């Protein structure tokens, strides 16, 4: 219940030799917290978790911490494939003060179900407490789960929220119809209204760290019975969202945010290649329009 | 498209009755246009995917055009799916949908051999050219059609001279709204109905749907309370949709749809064409409740 | 399976020749049941996806099939493909296919609506009554069909009683492998000219192909370098085969093969059935090149 | 330059004790048995061996020891990818400070990246190799990625590449792939359409099922040189028979399973969350085991 409402999937920033750039982590974690965002899920996907080590991602869940911890809502994003791995992670958020945890269903090998259940379970059983966040994510892993198991994975004890991230929503209503308390995150960002709308009670997202009152706008909107509201707010979320996809989403956000004077040096890890110097006027652009927004 | 204004709305998916003998059932057709109309439906699609249309030959679909709107004429609006595979046969139909005074014309994208989208856009052209003057639903279904289109593909589309419209069979919502961003006037009709207040604030402003043929006024009902920011009652209709859906899909559509218009005493026969099975025995108390709950309500 | 051993075979899948005003061309059908007999063909597989079955209406297809019992019927073996999205419809082509007396009957697993299993058998049961002693290809083409069936679908599906014979237009050749296994006297034919030689090895014991109207011989070439245990010229002649798909695949398979028949003087207009375009111009060069091309190497 | 590459390469199983550690004592003695098998070389840290539930100090021990037991006396390929380049960069140049004599890396996963993108993770990994020929992949089922053929004839020519390990049932494109580079070393990695594979063009394989039955997998190679179609063939379906089971086990687990009931590996487990063996596959684990020795 507390669990409830917009978080941002914080970006990971980078120094020019792609370590951990501890001012500008400090200062997009700020740049968050002055949005009125409801949270921070850190070292999600979106925090390119997957191309940093365990300690790497273990330092940002401290510098986090550090920074945020009782201002806002926490989650600690801890999935790895290894459930090992994962549940140090789970162990070190426990440790840091964080408010909850969540894991991406296990990828790359083919695991059954029932393997995902016991990879969940054992990373609550590190948890200590801290509740779990769920993933249904049939597209990046690629996994594909039906509608028994998804109440079987959302009411498994332990579990506080389900992570829905699907365009699926028939699925939505579904799960809302069965789960009338379970704490429901929003998942696709260029959905959100139409999310909320078949179901989801929040959302979890990248672009919400350059655009997050645009999705409070949308929650107040919906919220107010003010539809043309909503809707005129999603075309500008999807409007910025066309370009994100054209220059790669996390590079394209973190050089907006290089332009708001947030992150010093915009930089994904290797393989992620730069922003295509070609859109770099349209991104300043952006960034100036959205400082002009506040 | 600000000419197409008059098909904005909610349009059933009219099923077509057979009886036992698999024989077009054309009393049960003419009750159960009727019986959309007492519903207050804003028109009608005629022969679609959900009319079996592909189990139909082309004089079978020809004299269902001619009785609907024999029957429906001047009192809802009237869209004759005439899509076939074939261009040719598709303007057989697009000219006989014409000569029974029909309102518009609609084609799926023709399946199973893999066409190039350039012969896609001159399929359709040669459609709204025999359909002599009359506006033109397009496609996407991807999932029974295995068609995948990208957004200038689909603008293309929409805006070739004659398109009144989009029919859109897609659960993507993001895409919706970037349809709609791109064409405010366009006639915009959301295809999956257990999506449909969702579809509607993506941007679509009505929808085409085989459940509207037994519950057409909640559809109805979620256009007013989204046009009156009521997203409680939006959001009720839905569910209580979304609920028939669920039980429409363990029973099979077509045929859940046809047995509750059975038991309501709309359709004589709820059979769909071979090889479609029919409904599992074990399903018919749920439908006959059904059928008695929706007539109550 | 036992009952259909003489089905075993290379057998052209069928194209369709159609005139100016999108008619039927009924004199270059002939000019084409001819000029496959002469490639040593062990037969005709009759009114297929290949022959363009599904732009065609009821009619038309019986015209097609009632020809080709004309010219060849005792000759080289006749399978109609019957398949329609409706089962009456498919039952009427089929009781028509025994009428003209072809030796097989066939149907591809019916598409767009999502049908189940047991209305697949079904379907399959409902034909083969109507076929009335001929036997049945159950016709599997996952890429087109949209039709999805497991290993234990397709067991059920080439033992149900009158199926003698599976078409696997598949690449999948562990699955190709497994139905022998499970099926060792089922007529099991390659349907994926381009992996041929590769499908052989896996389990096909022969054939369907669009590509063996033009170039036939070459096929029956690689069953006979494989039988003489000759790795060397197999692997050549399939080389040879997918170097001639990699340009029937870019210019359009139905229409390539129809033009290069339409400058060997057998077809008169090289065009498909709307949607179906005609071919880029800027390929007539190679279609005409290669034309010539394999009458060299032929006769 | 290519050929000393060409051949039967089996994909190394890492195994493990009941507390998941590196069981080195085990991995030692797989090594062993795969050379004795008559194996041309070792696959090491591959998807195959549990790489992606491995620390990067984990593989490269793993890679010390097989360098140890197996340099000089067989081909050894390091699989070095990991979705980081950086990652994948150290353990590039952990395989050459260990002897290998090829490395290779996956095309990385997860985050969507581009062909361009792909490409310099691979020049990246191939200047840490200092040497190292690598070898590519063209994977369509495992990664998401969804190479076309002019794609593949830019990564196969790559300066430094000397091999595309070709993880796809499409023997249409392993035939254009042999006809546009008739010298290249070409590795069948369906081990179930190995034969036909062959046919296509391919000129060698990589494989997990190699660890029990590479002999057999040799043993086609053989067969369809001399032209004997029919034994080629008869021992596709041995394989297949074995992999069908393996497919309803498990096929990690399943293999460790077989090895252990042939007293090579000590504890049969895949690291969490894979789980173990269902115990009714065991009677049938157990037999496959005892009917392998048999055959030797
Ligand atoms: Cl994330
Ligand atoms: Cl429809
Ligand atoms: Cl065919
Ligand atoms: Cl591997």
Redesign the interface.
């Given at each position: 219940t507390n669990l409830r409402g917009v978080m941002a999937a914080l970006l990971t920033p980078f120094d020019q030799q792609?370590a951990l750039d501890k001012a500008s982590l400090r200062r997009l974690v700020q740049f968050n917290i002055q949005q009125g965002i409801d949270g921070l899920y850190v070292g999600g996907?979106t925090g390119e978790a997957?191309?940093?080590?365990?300690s790497e991602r273990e330092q940002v869940l401290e510098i986090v911490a550090e920074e945020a911890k009782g201002k806002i809502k926490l989650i600690a994003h801890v999935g790895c494939?290894?459930?090992?791995?994962s549940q140090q992670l789970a162990a070190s958020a426990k440790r840091y003060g964080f408010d909850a945890v969540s894991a991406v269903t296990?990828?790359?090998?083919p695991?059954?179900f029932?393997?995902?259940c016991?990879?969940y379970r054992?990373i609550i059983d590190s948890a200590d407490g801290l509740p779990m966040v769920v993933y249904n994510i049939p597209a990046?892993?690629?996994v594909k789960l039906t509608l028994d198991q998804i109440n079987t994975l959302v009411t498994l004890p332990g579990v506080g929220a389900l992570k829905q991230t699907s365009?699926?929503?028939?699925q939505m209503?579904?799960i809302r119809?069965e789960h009338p308390d379970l704490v429901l995150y929003n998942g696709?960002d260029?959905?959100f209204?139409?999310?909320l709308?078949?179901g989801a009670d929040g959302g979890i997202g990248s672009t919400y760290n350059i655009m997050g009152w645009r999705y409070q706008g949308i929650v107040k909107a919906?919220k107010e019975?003010?539809?043309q509201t909503?809707?005129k707010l999603?075309?500008e979320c999807?409007?910025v969202?066309?370009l994100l996809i054209k220059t790669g989403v996390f590079r394209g956000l973190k050089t907006v945010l290089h332009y708001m004077d947030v992150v010093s040096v915009p930089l994904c890890?290797?393989?992620?290649?730069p922003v295509d110097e070609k859109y770099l006027p349209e991104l300043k652009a952006l960034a100036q329009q959205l400082m002009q927004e506040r």
């Open positions: 792609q996907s997957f191309v940093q080590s365990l494939v290894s459930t090992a791995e296990p990828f790359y090998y695991f059954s029932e393997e995902h016991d990879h054992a990046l892993s690629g365009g699926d929503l028939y209503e579904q119809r696709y260029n959905i209204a139409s999310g709308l078949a919906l019975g003010d539809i909503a809707q999603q075309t999807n409007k969202i066309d890890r290797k393989p992620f290649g």
